[PDB]
Structure 1
Amino acid sequence: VDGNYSVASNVMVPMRDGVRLAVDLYRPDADGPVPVLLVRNPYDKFDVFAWSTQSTNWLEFVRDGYAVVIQDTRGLFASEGEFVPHVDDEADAEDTLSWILEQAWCDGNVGMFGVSYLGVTQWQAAVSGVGGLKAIAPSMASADLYRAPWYGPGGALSVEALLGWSALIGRQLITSRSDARPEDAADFVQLAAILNDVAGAASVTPLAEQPLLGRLIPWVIDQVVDHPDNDESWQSISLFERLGGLATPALITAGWYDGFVGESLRTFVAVKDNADARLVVGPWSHSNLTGRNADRKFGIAATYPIQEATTMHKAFFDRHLRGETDALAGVPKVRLFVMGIDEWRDETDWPLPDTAYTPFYLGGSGAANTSTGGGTLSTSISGTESADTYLYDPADPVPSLGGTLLFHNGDNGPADQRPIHDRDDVLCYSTEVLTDPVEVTGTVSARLFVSSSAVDTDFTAKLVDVFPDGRAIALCDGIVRMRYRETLVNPTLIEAGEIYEVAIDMLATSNVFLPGHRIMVQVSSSNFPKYDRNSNTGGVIAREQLEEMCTAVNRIHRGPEHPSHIVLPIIKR
């Protein structure tokens, strides 16, 4: 009967190596075989409520005649084997898809959907070239694990993401244990302590010493902390280069304040020529999909629209798994929440056609240090060769406030920056108060002319919307670790005092700066614990003791000969 279904729990699916993974089957009451959707989940297939509010009302898919299969990944919960992040997911997905294809109840069309880890696994599934896989819908995900979430395009470690997540997995490994252990109760409490104070846990040096996390999940050191370069151990699990080869439709969801935003958007750009790609980007962080934040509210329309997402996914799967060629009529290619005007808007492509990548140059009379310095931003090249200078001290890094934080205060993306404005290592450059709106929608980057007293250091840039009431709301940011200025693969040190021109990848945003506001840029050399602090030594940063580390006198050059600037994706419509 249409609308009706049954659920089979713990159906055991064998992999090529003989290890069995557990799945639940949500199957519609139907005569024949049906199209099937797969979700690969490290957080207990039973616990459907934990992730689904970030995704879709997917029981609707089942009431509409799709089967849904939810799998425990290798070594977790009801599945056999050993858990190690990422490394088995390609082969386990491929084996799972073949098994589904072979079933009486599968009509030979298979899709996937899901958020975060349930999104990353979909790219891993898609690169196996299994013909029966017709569509994916990776939400808040990445096809390159180095670039998101563990490191980034700037070559700094996302220490808060790493510790927070590892603590979360650790806690799961315990609550679910095969045979319960004496140390469990106390370990559980310690992992909670990390989660209640991620910045504190990230502060312990050497970073590479993790007695609890390294024991519970060795991968934390063996893979992540020990591999600061984008080396073969990373490329081995990276899917990105293979994406151009694909012809798989993808429904891609991202958030402006989500740790994966940079990489989600890249996946859209990489697939859009070869197959039907769709993009949806709201003002969300990884753990906050409400549209409400401490000092910034986007309105109820900004709240993750779970029912509309469901309708959209259903239309998408109906088109690609059911051959219903008109299912996506009236559905835009790209849908974006444009902040400032705080409104959803349709677009024909991403990047937007007609994007004017516009330089805004750093200038001003006298020191730019602090928000009451004289730093300016202007579309005109600065008149005179100046330089702003500050001391960066690893023992006192600029604290992270909003942005794409994941676990450490990850529920306040559009954070007010006023608490860090009076600091001397935060350089501020702002436009005059605007009398006309300025839409900035696209990827964002900075070109800075810099020098350091040290042989390595970091530089950060943050785009800020300054409100008339005083609120200075974070929009997007990035970092470059100087050793990785040219390449993430073969780092080289720098000469003290030599001027370098560096690119800072600041991910992306969509904001209208309204009349009465200013456009601002904060420049510094740290953003902790979003990124781990550079030791300023040229050493292996994660193996260094705080006391071993150096301070750095860092300098930003600006003027006609050194035209440092942020490049803004200006839209005029």
Structure 2
Amino acid sequence: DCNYSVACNVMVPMRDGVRLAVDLYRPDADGPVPVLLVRNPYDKFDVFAWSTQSTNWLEFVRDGYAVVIQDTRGLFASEGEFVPHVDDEADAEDTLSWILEQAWCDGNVGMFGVSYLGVTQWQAAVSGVGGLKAIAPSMASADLYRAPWYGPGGALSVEALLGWSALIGTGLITSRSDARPEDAADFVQLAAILNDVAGAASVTPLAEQPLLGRLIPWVIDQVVDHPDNDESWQSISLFERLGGLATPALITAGWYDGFVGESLRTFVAVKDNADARLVVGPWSHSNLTGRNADRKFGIAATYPIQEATTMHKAFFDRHLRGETDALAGVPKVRLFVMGIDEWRDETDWPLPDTAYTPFYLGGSGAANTSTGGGTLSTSISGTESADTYLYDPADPVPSLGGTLLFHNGDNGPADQRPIHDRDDVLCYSTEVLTDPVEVTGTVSARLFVSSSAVDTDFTAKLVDVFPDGRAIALCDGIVRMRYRETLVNPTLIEAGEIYEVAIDMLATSNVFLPGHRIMVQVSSSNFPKYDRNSNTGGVIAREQLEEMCTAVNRIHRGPEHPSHIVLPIIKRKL
């Protein structure tokens, strides 16, 4: 009982002859066992780095599962050349096939892990390997354009790209056969990016990346050079294949995690054909403590690694060991509901009784700044008005919290007061609430907009205004106007024309308590969460700052232009 062994650097041959290195954690007892696979680009040896964001998975080994941790192609002990995403479907298929052949595998395989270690699970799931009985993708996406590299709005997630590239670059250099003379200087420059991601993202043209483009050509060749959701992106997208799967998936997400919109969409895609589970906490990608600079969610909000381990084991016991009652009492969906700051079980996501309710932009006078006249109401505004501002790419609105990954990515529920005085931040608020209002679900806005430019962006951010004045970010999104109708086949806009556009603001779960207000901020930038629109209609990543243009942008509101945010309202009295 409990006892196990660990075999290092077992070489697994891929279909092209390149061998990937794995470590095998195998129970000492005789007879084949169910097996769990983790595919990792950050050194399979370095288990402490990621495991605290996942599970106490040695419990799985002690309980009689084998665990295989693999170095992805071209990194650490593995052979070959590393390129993000493009080899992971085939390498996962070949690795699963190898596992299933082994003396110690009983024909049942699962996977678990977070972020890149989650994405690789969707890539495995589409392989058609029958022996893969369940996956557990945490903080993951099945559409790499939509998360983490661009988004549903068609703006580049520039801090995500530069930060991750710098991190991997540090790993690529550490992985080296033999130390190179330039390595020391490269480390220094990578550290400089990671200490100042907004600074790195501010260089123009963005596509000129001497360091990152040399260490990882993909950064430019794939990501920066393909701003449209084109054939290059579809080739690594899994999402359209998810509907045809019948693989149980234990999906974890975080309200302030860069992958959240796409994590949730995977749950919706797979729930009808297999046993899907969902757990969503109030976490960002680098902060799963539940504690932030101006917002504390309580100790219950800390990533519940013991409970997660128990749930994963129950899930794998059901699907890999055929224990039909193993998930008895386990909810389908479990959400950390902010505001009340409590975990709560649900039967589905979206929640069954969600009332998708328009809250209309209104008010007397200009809505510019937090001291403007901007209102939100469930009633349509009676008078036609417009709020106008200048968006200058040289002075974008700074990103504060939200779903930042690498640039200040540890303060999701950030206080927005530092940007409230900006004339390009339009604010609309409800009256102070006397009764609680729960907003739990996907969130979007429909805005009537116009611009002096042939392209620009519009942003929308949902905010909980506390009694003491803290204006806490909840969720946000962007629409890049050339992609207002399609991410695939963009077209420019006509200056001065009014367009009705949708902004995908991902999702949240928050009870706005009595004494609070519901607030929305509208602008045309959110940098470096998203790169800045040049307002030219050009190839944005190839433009110098000085050739970018300012734009006079307009939000129209009234009876004939009923701009609004759609809130997923949950009303519970019992």
TM-score computed with the length of structure 1 as normaliser = 1.00
Q: Residues of 1 paired with 2:301 and 2:566: CA distance?
A: 27
Q: Residues of 2 paired with 1:119 and 1:464: CA distance?
A: 29
Q: Residues of 2 paired with 1:30 and 1:326: CA distance?
A: 25
Q: Residues of 1 paired with 2:119 and 2:421: CA distance?
A: 40
Could you tell me how far 1:176 is from its partner in structure 2? 2.2
Give SS of 2:263's match: helix
Q: Residues of 2 paired with 1:193 and 1:552: CA distance?
A: 32
Could you tell me how far 1:30 is from its partner in structure 2? 1.6
Q: Residues of 1 paired with 2:546 and 2:75: CA distance?
A: 40
Cα distance per residue 1:537-570 (max 9 Å; x no partner): 0000000000000000000000000000000000
**How do 1:68-107 residues align onto structure 2 when only pairs under 5 Å count?**
68-107=67-106
Cα distance per residue 1:248-271 (max 9 Å; x no partner): 000000000000000000000000
Give SS of 1:474's match: strand
Could you tell me how far 1:455 is from its partner in structure 2? 0.1
Q: Residues of 1 paired with 2:549 and 2:373: CA distance?
A: 29
Equivalent position of 1:527 in the other structure? 526
Q: Residues of 1 paired with 2:30 and 2:40: CA distance?
A: 29
Could you tell me how far 1:341 is from its partner in structure 2? 0.1
Q: Residues of 1 paired with 2:468 and 2:178: CA distance?
A: 57
Q: Residues of 1 paired with 2:228 and 2:27: CA distance?
A: 48
Q: Residues of 2 paired with 1:354 and 1:172: CA distance?
A: 47
Cα distance per residue 1:75-116 (max 9 Å; x no partner): 000000000000000000000000000000000000000000
Q: Residues of 2 paired with 1:260 and 1:216: CA distance?
A: 25
Equivalent position of 1:485 in the other structure? 484
Equivalent position of 1:430 in the other structure? 429
Cα distance per residue 1:1-51 (max 9 Å; x no partner): x10100000000000000000000000012210000000000000000000
Cα distance per residue 1:479-517 (max 9 Å; x no partner): 000000000000000000000000000000000000000
Q: Residues of 1 paired with 2:228 and 2:273: CA distance?
A: 31
Could you tell me how far 1:74 is from its partner in structure 2? 0.1
Give SS of 1:451's match: strand
**How do 1:110-149 residues align onto structure 2 when only pairs under 5 Å count?**
110-149=109-148
Give SS of 2:449's match: strand
Q: Residues of 2 paired with 1:101 and 1:330: CA distance?
A: 31
Q: Residues of 1 paired with 2:332 and 2:107: CA distance?
A: 27
Give SS of 2:243's match: helix
Q: Residues of 1 paired with 2:79 and 2:177: CA distance?
A: 10
Q: Residues of 2 paired with 1:75 and 1:7: CA distance?
A: 23
Question: 172-181 or 19-28: which moved more?
Answer: 172-181
Task: Name stretches of at least 5 consecutive residues in structure 2 with no aligned partner.
Answer: none
Question: 175-184 or 543-552: which moved more?
Answer: 175-184
Q: Residues of 2 paired with 1:360 and 1:392: CA distance?
A: 25
Give SS of 2:568's match: strand
Cα distance per residue 1:506-532 (max 9 Å; x no partner): 000000000000000000000000000
Equivalent position of 1:25 in the other structure? 24
Equivalent position of 1:360 in the other structure? 359
Q: Residues of 2 paired with 1:129 and 1:266: CA distance?
A: 21
Give SS of 1:506's match: strand
Q: Residues of 1 paired with 2:22 and 2:422: CA distance?
A: 53
Q: Residues of 2 paired with 1:65 and 1:403: CA distance?
A: 40
Q: Residues of 1 paired with 2:173 and 2:132: CA distance?
A: 34
Equivalent position of 1:415 in the other structure? 414
How many residues are matched? 572
Cα distance per residue 1:372-412 (max 9 Å; x no partner): 00000000000100000000000000000000000000000
Q: Residues of 2 paired with 1:183 and 1:42: CA distance?
A: 23
Runs ≥4 residues deviating over 3 A: none
**How do 1:188-203 residues align onto structure 2 when only pairs under 5 Å count?**
188-203=187-202
Give the CA RMSD over aligned residues: 0.3
Could you tell me how far 1:146 is from its partner in structure 2? 0.2
Could you tell me how far 1:432 is from its partner in structure 2? 0.1
Give SS of 1:245's match: coil
Q: Residues of 2 paired with 1:199 and 1:185: CA distance?
A: 23
Q: Residues of 2 paired with 1:282 and 1:101: CA distance?
A: 34
Give SS of 2:357's match: strand
Could you tell me how far 1:211 is from its partner in structure 2? 0.4
Could you tell me how far 1:174 is from its partner in structure 2? 1.0
**How do 1:152-167 residues align onto structure 2 when only pairs under 5 Å count?**
152-167=151-166
Q: Residues of 1 paired with 2:56 and 2:491: CA distance?
A: 49
Could you tell me how far 1:288 is from its partner in structure 2? 0.2
Could you tell me how far 1:198 is from its partner in structure 2? 0.1
Could you tell me how far 1:175 is from its partner in structure 2? 1.8
Cα distance per residue 1:389-443 (max 9 Å; x no partner): 0000000000000000000000000000000000000000000000000000000
Q: Residues of 2 paired with 1:362 and 1:245: CA distance?
A: 41
Q: Residues of 2 paired with 1:153 and 1:464: CA distance?
A: 20
Give SS of 1:459's match: strand
Equivalent position of 2:287 in the other structure? 288
Give SS of 1:248's match: coil
Q: Residues of 2 paired with 1:221 and 1:120: CA distance?
A: 21
Q: Residues of 2 paired with 1:496 and 1:463: CA distance?
A: 28
Cα distance per residue 1:227-248 (max 9 Å; x no partner): 0000000000000000001000
Q: Residues of 1 paired with 2:473 and 2:30: CA distance?
A: 54
Equivalent position of 1:226 in the other structure? 225
Cα distance per residue 1:440-474 (max 9 Å; x no partner): 00000000000000000000000000000000000
Cα distance per residue 1:182-224 (max 9 Å; x no partner): 1000010000000000000000000000000000000000000
**How do 1:350-429 residues align onto structure 2 when only pairs under 5 Å count?**
350-429=349-428
Q: Residues of 2 paired with 1:422 and 1:287: CA distance?
A: 29
Identity %: 99
Equivalent position of 1:542 in the other structure? 541
Q: Residues of 2 paired with 1:102 and 1:169: CA distance?
A: 32
Q: Residues of 2 paired with 1:344 and 1:243: CA distance?
A: 28
Q: Residues of 2 paired with 1:29 and 1:78: CA distance?
A: 25
Give SS of 1:162's match: helix
Q: Residues of 1 paired with 2:392 and 2:108: CA distance?
A: 56
